[PDB]
Amino acid sequence: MFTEIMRYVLDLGPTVMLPIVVILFSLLLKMKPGDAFKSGIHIGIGFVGIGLVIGLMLDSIGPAAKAMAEAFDINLKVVDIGWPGSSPMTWASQIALIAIPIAIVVNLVMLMTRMTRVVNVDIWNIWHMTFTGALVHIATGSYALAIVGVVVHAAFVYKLGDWFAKDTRDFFGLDGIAIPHGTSAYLGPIAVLVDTVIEKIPGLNRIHFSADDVQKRFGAFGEPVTIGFVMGLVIGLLAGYEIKAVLQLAVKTAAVMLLMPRVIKPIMDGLTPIAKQARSRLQAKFGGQDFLIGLDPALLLGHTSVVSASLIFIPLTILIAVVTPGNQVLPFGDLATIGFFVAMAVAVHQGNLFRTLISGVIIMSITLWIATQTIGLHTQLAANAGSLTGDGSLVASMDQGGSPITYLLVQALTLENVIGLVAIGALYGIGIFLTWRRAKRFAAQAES
Amino acid sequence: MFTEIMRYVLDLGPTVMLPIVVILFSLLLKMKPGDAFKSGIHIGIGFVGIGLVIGLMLDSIGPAAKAMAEAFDINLKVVDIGWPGSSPMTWASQIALIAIPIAIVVNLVMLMTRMTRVVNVDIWNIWHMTFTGALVHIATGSYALAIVGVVVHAAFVYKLGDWFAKDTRDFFGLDGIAIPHGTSAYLGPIAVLVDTVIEKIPGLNRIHFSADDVQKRFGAFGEPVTIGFVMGLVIGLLAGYEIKAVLQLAVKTAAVMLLMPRVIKPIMDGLTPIAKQARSRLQAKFGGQDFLIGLDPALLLGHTSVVSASLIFIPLTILIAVVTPGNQVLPFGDLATIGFFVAMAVAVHQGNLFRTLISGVIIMSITLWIATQTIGLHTQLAANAGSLTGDGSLVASMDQGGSPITYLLVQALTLENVIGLVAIGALYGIGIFLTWRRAKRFAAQAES
């Protein structure tokens, strides 16, 4: 009966079950029924808006990006599928129904001993941990090792969401909300390492560039919506699209970027009183820092800089896919939502487009190489799920196939590529240590 | 040479060609190119948001309303198709590509003679005039009568948009914007007549009921979002939907109602400088009242009362379709957007839900009676367009097939139903005289 009720809860959707969870939390906080109902329905309001705008992103950008990818290069054989094609594949795994209870238990345990302050409530993003566990099970061949991998990934994701609280609170303005899930969370340490390296280099640190500089230089034409329209038009032109298609796509890009914050806003409007009462009661009873709430990484698309970088990086990603040595994966699926990769990079760089570009280039190269490395495991997963054609063609993805955590876990658990494991582990360990030191320093400075 | 360029302009879409028209108008007003481009792109963004929200509303309500209709009654045989099924039928007619130039010419002629002040720019809503012209051509059998029917319909809708300027400016807050198209425009006079009749009878006028009263009565549960959620929930429950589907549908109803004004706002945000400069220059050059701009009737959905009426009236109109004498049309297609019918009724009644309900009942019964009356013409139009199944099943629509103007023109030109012609003509003429007198009185009062 547990599997059936878990499947029902999953099928309820983020727009129904999450408002129920928020209402229950508010009721546990001793509020009036009206406030809890309003907060829940507002959160559902924002999430429905997010889903609609993301669907617009997909059906507007996907076709154009894919057409440009075919037009540019044909050397790369393996074709990316991205998160829209990976998440249903992941949900068909045999551990898809136990990963959610395991993650919930580990979150409760880490909250009980005050090792974290992130109360994750988005259970539709647990498929990341499910994917890592499935890959570990496929590679090593042991169920217990897969469970250990899921636990490790969940703990690391929660700790990373805790560490990046300052950037979400300040740069994005999402006060009281933390984002532990998504590709932005675990690609943060690379951006932190790149920022530290650039800061160390004299002369290069003097280069500053932001959308505000663009607006100042170009007058009324530098206003962000104009630059988004221009980027959409350029992407349409590069894809060989017709004039009417180019204009429609550019208008769609400007529209999605303009409407992202308008649909995010109801979530904050509904969650403000909940956070206020939480800080009023739970912080008084227990103590410590603010109790953050985990949410979907789609909330990071509200900032104009994030979506601007997303539009800019599609041709940049396609260019990177040709120059990266030992690369066979052609970015095909998540090019529409490539902003999820470099959102935390933009937040860390505080909108500095030069350092954002450098960090995004390095992140794209690293994730493309990793996705090239993890192909046999991914095609084995595809065969296991049954969503694979009979031609025997390989498959790969970058949203979760190329995550550094999964590659590091698999390499450390089976030791098949020691040189790549050593290199990626050194880079990611330096990034993690740097981001932890930076988070501790920021917390100490804010406290003092 | 004109046919394919007109087809291309039509296919450009409201999000591309209309911003180009706005930019050209702004340039003719001697603004800087940057501000003109910003206004045009903002209007495009608003229209894209309108399209997205309308698509969500359709995909959320349509199936639910259709299931409601199937579950409730089976006595009615003819199945409505609504505007989504009528617009491709109308645009495939023989007079499809002449109607747009005819409407533009008649608008220019009426503007030059100072007979009207509505500068219609939405060329995608001309399909109402195309529909009435095609119906007249089918009934009478001559091209010239079709042309004169198109001209008469265009002049009537332009004058109706002129007369309802105060309601749009004040009640909906759309300053400088007129709505000559849509079912709301030509179903206004019935609402005006009903309001006058209610005012005449003492005691009935003393009943006042508005959404503000509901909010005051219900405290923390009387907000528009909460009542919309309740209406969605009851619609799902009475339709035989499952619990998850019911909750998702209710959340989607709350979604459309709450997100309507947020996506409505960019249109005014972009159009305000255009109207300001028009008032500064064109009024000084020529004189007279403001030069209003015709747009989509979907803008009336921004008001919360209109959406609330749209949700409540669906079971109401389905019930009305059973008790209406001599009715054979089952409302099936435009149940999703039933709010377009009673928008102007709400505007006339100033949000009085009691008079809104009475006017809506009268309008529903009347328009269903016409929709039953005009069935042979509609199925002949379907056969001409080629979109008719070979089973011989009758077709009928109520958004435009049941509109009073087309029925009145057909009856006046062919004289096939004297009793129906005289009844509908008397009712509509009394409504038109009353609304013209009301508009003249309002203009005189504002001038004084």
Side-chain angles (χ1 to χ4, degrees), chain A residues 9-191:
Chain A
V9 166
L10 261 173
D11 286 353
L12 270 196
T15 82
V16 154
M17 195 40 179
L18 206 170
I20 298 285
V21 171
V22 170
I23 282 179
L24 289 185
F25 277 177
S26 186
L27 257 301
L28 291 177
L29 209 31
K30 311 307 168 56
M31 338 201 79
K32 309 307 291 171
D35 313 314
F37 195 11
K38 168 177 184 174
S39 307
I41 179 46
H42 270 77
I43 288 199
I45 273 296
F47 265 101
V48 171
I50 287 302
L52 275 181
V53 178
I54 284 300
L56 162 72
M57 201 156 308
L58 257 58
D59 78 324
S60 51
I61 311 293
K66 293 158 189 181
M68 142 178 51
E70 321 305 357
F72 269 156
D73 48 72
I74 79 158
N75 210 35
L76 325 177
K77 312 305 291 178
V78 190
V79 162
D80 185 2
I81 57 184
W83 72 269
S86 295
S87 93
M89 173 149 48
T90 300
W91 278 124
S93 311
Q94 75 280 344
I95 79 169
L97 301 189
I98 210 55
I100 310 174
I102 277 181
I104 287 174
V105 162
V106 85
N107 179 215
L108 292 196
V109 156
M110 271 187 2
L111 263 156
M112 184 164 172
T113 174
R114 318 292 260 188
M115 262 187 251
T116 197
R117 304 302 276 272
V118 176
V119 187
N120 160 56
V121 305
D122 198 295
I123 78 156
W124 295 260
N125 278 253
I126 308 293
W127 73 267
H128 299 277
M129 312 149 189
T130 313
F131 187 93
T132 66
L135 251 65
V136 163
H137 176 206
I138 285 170
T140 72
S142 178
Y143 201 50
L145 265 291
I147 291 319
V148 161
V150 167
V151 163
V152 158
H153 185 102
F156 183 49
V157 151
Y158 294 155
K159 277 304 293 178
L160 254 181
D162 202 343
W163 282 332
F164 276 131
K166 146 87 163 189
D167 294 338
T168 76
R169 163 183 86 243
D170 283 24
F171 193 78
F172 297 107
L174 313 172
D175 199 292
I177 276 73
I179 308 294
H181 308 278
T183 80
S184 49
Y186 59 81
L187 292 180
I190 305 182

Side-chain angles (χ1 to χ4, degrees), chain B residues 12 53 61 74 83 87 92 110 158 164 206 240 269 280 296 299-300 309 314 329 348 350 355 375 402 408 439 441:
Chain B
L12 268 193
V53 179
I61 304 293
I74 74 162
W83 68 271
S87 89
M110 285 197 351
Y158 289 157
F164 277 130
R206 314 307 312 122
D269 298 356
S280 301
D296 209 28
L299 274 83
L300 317 172
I314 292 168
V329 155
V348 165
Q350 274 161 58
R355 300 181 200 173
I375 275 188
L408 280 189
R441 176 184 321 246

